[PDB]
Amino acid sequence: MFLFFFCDLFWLRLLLCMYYCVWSRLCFIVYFNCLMLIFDFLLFCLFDLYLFVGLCLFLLLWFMLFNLYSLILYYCITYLNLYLLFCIVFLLYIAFLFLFCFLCDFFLFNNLLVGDSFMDVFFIRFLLCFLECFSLLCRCLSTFLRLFCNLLSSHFLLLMFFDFFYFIFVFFFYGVFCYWFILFIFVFCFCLLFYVFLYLLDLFAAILQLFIFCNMILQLIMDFLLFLLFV
Amino acid sequence: YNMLVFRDPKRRPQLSEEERAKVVVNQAEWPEEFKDFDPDDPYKNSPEIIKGMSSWNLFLWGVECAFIYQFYELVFPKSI
Amino acid sequence: HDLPEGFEFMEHKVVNKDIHAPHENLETLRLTLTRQDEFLLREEPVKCVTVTGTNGEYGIYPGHAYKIVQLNPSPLTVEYTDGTTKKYFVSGGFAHINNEGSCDVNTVECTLLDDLDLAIAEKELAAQQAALGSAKDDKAKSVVEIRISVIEAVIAALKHH
Amino acid sequence: IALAGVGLGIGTIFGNLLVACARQPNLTKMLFNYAILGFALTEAIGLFALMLAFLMLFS
Amino acid sequence: IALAGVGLGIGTIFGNLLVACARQPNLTKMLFNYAILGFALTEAIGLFALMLAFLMLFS
Amino acid sequence: IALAGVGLGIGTIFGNLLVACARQPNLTKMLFNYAILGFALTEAIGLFALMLAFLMLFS
Amino acid sequence: IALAGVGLGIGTIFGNLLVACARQPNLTKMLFNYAILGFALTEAIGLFALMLAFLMLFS
Amino acid sequence: STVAISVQGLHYVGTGLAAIALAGVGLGIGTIFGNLLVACARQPNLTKMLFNYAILGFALTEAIGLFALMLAFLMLFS
Amino acid sequence: STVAISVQGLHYVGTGLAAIALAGVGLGIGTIFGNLLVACARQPNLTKMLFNYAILGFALTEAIGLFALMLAFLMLFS
Amino acid sequence: STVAISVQGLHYVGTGLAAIALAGVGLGIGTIFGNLLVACARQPNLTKMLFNYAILGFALTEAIGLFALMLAFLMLFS
Amino acid sequence: STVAISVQGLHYVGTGLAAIALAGVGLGIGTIFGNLLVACARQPNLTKMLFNYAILGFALTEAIGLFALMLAFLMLFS
Amino acid sequence: STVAISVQGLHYVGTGLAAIALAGVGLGIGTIFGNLLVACARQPNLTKMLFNYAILGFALTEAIGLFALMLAFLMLFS
Amino acid sequence: MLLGGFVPRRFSQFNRDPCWMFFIFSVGFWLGEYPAMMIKYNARDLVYDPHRYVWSHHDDHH
Numbered sequence A: 001m002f003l004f005f006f007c008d009l010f011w012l013r014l015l016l017c018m019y020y021c022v023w024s025r026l027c028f029i030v031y032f033n034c035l036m037l038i039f040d041f042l043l044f045c046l047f048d049l050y051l052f053v054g055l056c057l058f059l060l061l062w063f064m065l066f067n068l069y070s071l072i073l074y075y076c077i078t079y080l081n082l083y084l085l086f087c088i089v090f091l092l093y094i095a096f097l098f099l100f101c102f103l104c105d106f107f108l109f110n111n112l113l114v115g116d117s118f119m120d121v122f123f124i125r126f127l128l129c130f131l132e133c134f135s136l137l138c139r140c141l142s143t144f145l146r147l148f149c150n151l152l153s154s155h156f157l158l159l160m161f162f163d164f165f166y167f168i169f170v171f172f173f174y175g176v177f178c179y180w181f182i183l184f185i186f187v188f189c190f191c192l193l194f195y196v197f198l199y200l201l202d203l204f205a206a207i208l209q210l211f212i213f214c215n216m217i218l219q220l221i222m223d224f225l226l227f228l229l230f231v
Numbered sequence B: 001y002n003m004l005v006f007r008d009p010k011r012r013p014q015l016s017e018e019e020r021a022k023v024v025v026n027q028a029e030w031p032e033e034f035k036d037f038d039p040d041d042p043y044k045n046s047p048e049i050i051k052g053m054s055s056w057n058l059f060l061w062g063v064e065c066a067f068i069y070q071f072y073e074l075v076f077p078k079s080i
Numbered sequence C: 001h002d003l004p005e006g007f008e009f010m011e012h013k014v015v016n017k018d019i020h021a022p023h024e025n026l027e028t029l030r031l032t033l034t035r036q037d038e039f040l041l042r043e044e045p046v047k048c049v050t051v052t053g054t055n056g057e058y059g060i061y062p063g064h065a066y067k068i069v070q071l072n073p074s075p076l077t078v079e080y081t082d083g084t085t086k087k088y089f090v091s092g093g094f095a096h097i098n099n100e101g102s103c104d105v106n107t108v109e110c111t112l113l114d115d116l117d118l119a120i121a122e123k124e125l126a127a128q129q130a131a132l133g134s135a136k137d138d139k140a141k142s143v144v145e146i147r148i149s150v151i152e153a154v155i156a157a158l159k160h161h
Numbered sequence D, E, F, G: 001i002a003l004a005g006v007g008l009g010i011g012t013i014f015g016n017l018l019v020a021c022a023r024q025p026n027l028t029k030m031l032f033n034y035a036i037l038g039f040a041l042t043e044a045i046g047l048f049a050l051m052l053a054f055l056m057l058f059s
Numbered sequence H, I, J, K, L: 001s002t003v004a005i006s007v008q009g010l011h012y013v014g015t016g017l018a019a020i021a022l023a024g025v026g027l028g029i030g031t032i033f034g035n036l037l038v039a040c041a042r043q044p045n046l047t048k049m050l051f052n053y054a055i056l057g058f059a060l061t062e063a064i065g066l067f068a069l070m071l072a073f074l075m076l077f078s
Numbered sequence M: 001m002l003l004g005g006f007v008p009r010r011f012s013q014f015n016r017d018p019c020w021m022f023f024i025f026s027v028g029f030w031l032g033e034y035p036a037m038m039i040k041y042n043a044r045d046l047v048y049d050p051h052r053y054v055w056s057h058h059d060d061h062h
């Protein structure tokens, strides 16, 4: 089976071509922490710690073109599938993990054995090591699941509320002319307030979830970085 | 002021009070568009893009387009 | 006739840090210990200082949050970054902790734990206990209890090490 | 219902974050990062509940 | 539902960690070691809860 | 569900441990042993609930 | 489920114990004995619930 | 139609519920001893009077536990 | 069709639920005494007035537990 | 087929659930007195004033429990 | 086969569950007044101002209980 | 054999369970106001700003109650 | 990022810029489609389908 379909970004691609044929400065970045990993001067890293910048920027752009514009009615999030997000997160997370593992430095994993020598190795330290090695994969899974489900839930709620608003607005507006107009006016004002609140909440959460999607990957990278001091 | 979430930008003052008080205002040199300039309504005297085209006219045009979109089939129905 | 304020003579003002300022990782704490208007340490860099306030003990390390502590009769420990411990005993006062990396302990009386003696404390404790029964009134009993508590704290500090 | 113990747990972390910032405001960054780490771990547990929730819902 | 306690318990540890560091920022390493020790010990109970769920959902 | 009251209890112990350590770090080696002792007791309670969860699950 | 409170109650005792020890390390022995006393009292209720569980299990 | 039904196993369910109330009792004990230690550290001189009051708190809280436990056993055997 | 059913053992279930109401009552009493120890430690001279208020709180909390217990026994005998 | 059923014994279950509301009320009252002891030990000069407010809080908190208890009686006697 | 069943006594369960929500309201009120007593002992001069805000929380906290109470009647009497 | 059953009284249970969600909202509001009173005494010069923030939190909590109440009325009628 | 641009002070100024002219036309369409739906879907002569019980989405997805 081979299905032929198209993404819902064609108009946005056209706009990008129209508006970015000429250069323009970028100063506001959703995830700025990917550009400033080191805060104490004289610390430098021999590992390619700035390799994630390009992928971070492209992912932010793509996910913003999809999620933020999905608030507009009938706009489709073409990539909204659990296993597709799993594939994306797998690619990124496992690529960085294999970059660290291909380094063939086993000492890099010494920190996995949590704790100190004073704790039982077999019954305490080793169990915690197993749990943490499990927690890495759990972090990958959690990133992808959170990204999927936030969107799905928010859009379900928006659709339900819009259906209710359409129903009451269409089939109960005549009450404006009746003696119970005050009840309808109160309900309509409540619905408008809720509409505005939902839109603001979704706009903020769409950007926050991308902050956190990129932050998880950057945290994975940082968990294995070692900084040397200049002398 | 604001129009929904769109806020009108405001220029920060650059002159001190002492220097500002010594400035002589001569609106005769100002353009006709900006005379009696009011920060709360800077575009009150701004010319219309289309002469005789009011905002309410465009709003009514949109309403009529919606009515057509909803009622055209009621007058010219077509078979499946 | 512009009376010079007495504080103006003391140019060693306190260095308070603004809230919004960027963080600095400090490795030493500037300790200023004072007894009866006589300092024993002048902004000495130390690794940490242990002080027994009213609520409990406090281990102050560099970067500790700004706070005010009302001390109680008890020992005080100072551990330097070198790895040397110096122990005094204080009878009361206040300790000011600054988030900028300073700790000023101004006590009414701060004496080395070594200068104190055990047998002297024991006999004084016995005398106070004997005098407690013969207390003239409630105020005398409270005063004796205060004296007994101080002696017990001194004895406990000596017996600890 | 497991999400109830997750939402509250997240609220606890951020509740303590504000106090910690109020006590050592200069250290906001380290506190903020550890709060995110705690939030991440707590969310991971809640998702495992969601994994079971969706597995049973479609079974 | 057992995850509700685990999720809340983890948040409580980090909640204390934030204030603990604000009190003594110089010990943001020693305290951190004990916190993740706690996360692993609390998550261990969650594995049993998940194991029972998977041992009954697939049964 | 009994594990919910166990995992949460463990988190409470460690949460207070961090505050205790942040107050008297020189006593950490002593407090940590007591913290382990508490975990050795709350975990034991969880075993009893786990035992029932297994006896009924295989009977 | 009765064990949930019992296990949590123990954590509270061993949570406050660390705080109490730091404030007054000289009284660790007396505080430790009281903590054991509280643990025994809580464990008594735990066995009461455990007794009921077993009786209804093998009956 | 009139139907009268007598389920024998339901008495087990009620007994288990009565046992749940023990959690509110057991946790209450920890709270009293959780704050007793702090009070002892705060005012060590009153290690005796505080201990007696804590025991009284245990007695009152324990008495509530037995009241619930009585219902648990009554339905278990009836 | 009209069907009337009378299930007997349900009263055990309802009674067990009322027993859970004592969980908060037991916890609430423990909270009062826990705060009492700290208050006594903070102000050791007020060892009687605080004790009197603690008794008052226990009496009120016990009354709530008794209210629930009346339903627990009443349903068990209905 | 259409079947109409009328169970008598369900009213016991609903009654027991209402009693659970008392768990929060009983705990809430304990919280008020717990703070009262702390407040009194922190400013004993206002003990009488604080006691008056505590009674007010108890009356308001108790009122909620009565609402749940009323529902229990309504279902228990119907 | 298609079977339609109408159980008449199930509204008792729904009513009891709704009443359980009152536990949170009662606990919330107790917390409000507990903090009020502590706050007053700290800043007695502003006791009156604190009291007004405490009542405001009660007004905004009791209202939620009414909604839960309302659902009880809508189901108890239907 | 294939059997399809339609119980007309199960929406009461769902409505009651949804109403239980208000217990968290009520307690959450109580926590907000409890802290507000404590904060006001600590820094009374900022009463208005704290009051505004408390109202903001209350509104957010009330919205969650409406979400929970939204699922209640829908099930109750639908 | 919502930094700047023309901002009409009131309705009457929406005709002072082509973009806002299009915006107000769109708002008119949006708000005027609702009264049209009210009139159309609450009409006296509107009749439910006699065969509406023959089939429904509820049986299909079930």
Ligand SMILES: CCCCCCCCCCCCCCCCCC(=O)OC[C@H](COP(=O)([O-])OCC(O)COP(=O)([O-])OC[C@@H](COC(=O)CCCCCCCCCCCCCCCCC)OC(=O)CCCCCCCCCCCCCCCCC)OC(=O)CCCCCCCCCCCCCCCCC
Residues within 6 Å of the ligand: A002, A003, A004, A005, A006, A007, A013
């Ligand atoms: C049998 C029926 C026919 C079908 C046969 C199919 C055979 C299949 C074989 C088996 C394959 C198995 C695997 C399939 C997996 C599919 C997965 C999938 O689809 O995932 C979704 C996923 C969706 O991606 P997306 O996010 O939508 O972005 C992809 C878009 O292309 C947009 O992305 P982009 O914008 O980033 O792309 C770059 C873009 C950059 O932007 C552009 O270049 C702009 C233009 C974009 C064009 C592409 C978009 C197409 C839009 C819809 C169609 C347009 C109208 C077509 C009208 C047809 C009328 C009948 O540049 C181009 O696209 C370069 C091409 C430019 C062509 C210009 C031609 C100019 C001609 C001028 C002639 C003038 C003559 C004058 C004569 C004068 C004489 C006097 O698809 C893909 O990723 C691509 C899948 C392709 C798989 C390979 C298939 C095999 C090749 C088939 C070729 C058939 C040619 C013959 C057709 C004849 C007519 C019937």
Ligand SMILES: CCCCCCCCCCCCCCCCCC(=O)OC[C@H](COP(=O)([O-])OCC(O)COP(=O)([O-])OC[C@@H](COC(=O)CCCCCCCCCCCCCCCCC)OC(=O)CCCCCCCCCCCCCCCCC)OC(=O)CCCCCCCCCCCCCCCCC
Residues within 6 Å of the ligand: B053, B054, B055, B056, B057, B059, B060, B063, M010, M011, M012, M027, M031, M032, M035
């Ligand atoms: C500050 C807000 C900014 C917007 C922000 C962005 C959007 C936010 C979302 C909310 C937007 C709200 C809607 C926009 C405002 C619309 C009203 C308005 O301002 O009008 C300006 C405008 C004056 O501004 P102007 O720029 O100086 O206009 C110049 C002149 O008007 C002269 O105009 P012209 O030069 O273009 O000439 C046009 C021409 C032609 O003018 C006309 O055609 C006059 C209108 C006739 C009715 C046609 C339908 C009108 C539309 C109704 C449906 C709209 C639904 C949507 C409403 C949404 C409200 C939420 O004039 C004439 O010939 C004069 C008429 C003489 C005949 C009088 C008799 C009429 C008989 C009609 C029979 C038909 C009845 C129906 C049943 C028939 C059965 C057989 O006032 C009017 O003309 C209004 C008249 C009708 C009022 C009711 C309209 C519906 C309800 C609107 C409520 C708005 C509430 C706003 C609250 C704000 C609180 C801060």
Ligand SMILES: CCCCCCCCCCCCCCCCCC(=O)OC[C@H](COP(=O)([O-])OCC[N+](C)(C)C)OC(=O)CCCCCCCCCCCCCCCCC
Residues within 6 Å of the ligand: B065, B068, B069, B070, B072, B073, M018, M021, M022, M025
């Ligand atoms: C010899 C020469 C002879 C010449 C004779 C010429 C005769 C001409 C007769 C009249 C022709 C009229 C044609 C136009 C009307 C067509 C109506 C129609 O079919 O509609 C069906 C369609 C609907 O078809 P439908 O039936 O599929 O839609 C129904 C859909 N449901 C069922 C879901 C409700 O209607 C429309 O889409 C109408 C859209 C609006 C039309 C008007 C547009 C005006 C411009 C607005 C945009 C620009 C604004 C700019 C503002 C800012 C400026 C700066």
Ligand SMILES: CCCCCCCCCCCCCCCCCC(=O)OC[C@H](COP(=O)([O-])OCC[N+](C)(C)C)OC(=O)CCCCCCCCCCCCCCCCC
Residues within 6 Å of the ligand: A015, A016, A019, A068, A069, A071, A072, A073, A162, A166, A199, A203, B004, B005, M001, M002, M026, M027, M029, M030, M031
């Ligand atoms: C950085 C933050 C950005 C915030 C932007 C704030 C925008 C504020 C918008 C105010 C209201 C606008 C109303 C428009 C109405 C249009 C006509 C209409 O009928 O629509 C009704 C539609 C739907 O209304 P409806 O649901 O009532 O429609 C009823 C129709 N029936 C009954 C048939 C179902 O309105 C919307 O859905 C508009 C929601 C907008 C939400 C904000 C989207 C922001 C993200 C996209 C930004 C795009 C920028 C691109 C720039 C270029 C990039 C290179």
Ligand SMILES: CCCCCCCC/C=C\CCCCCCCC(=O)O[C@H](COC(=O)CCCCCCC/C=C/CCCCCCCC)COP(=O)(O)OCCN
Residues within 6 Å of the ligand: A173, A174, A176, A177, A178, M035, M038, M039, M040, M042, M043, M044, M046
């Ligand atoms: C030729 C047109 C003449 C127009 C005159 C209108 C006069 C109306 C006066 C009375 C109005 C109130 C009536 C109350 C009862 C209405 C009941 C109803 O909906 O009946 C519809 C009549 O309803 C309609 O069709 C009209 C619906 C509403 C029309 C709205 C008109 C435009 C409103 C624009 C709103 C824009 C915003 C303005 C806000 C102002 C207030 C804040 C007819 O069908 P029925 O036989 O009753 O039942 C059908 C079941 N099969």
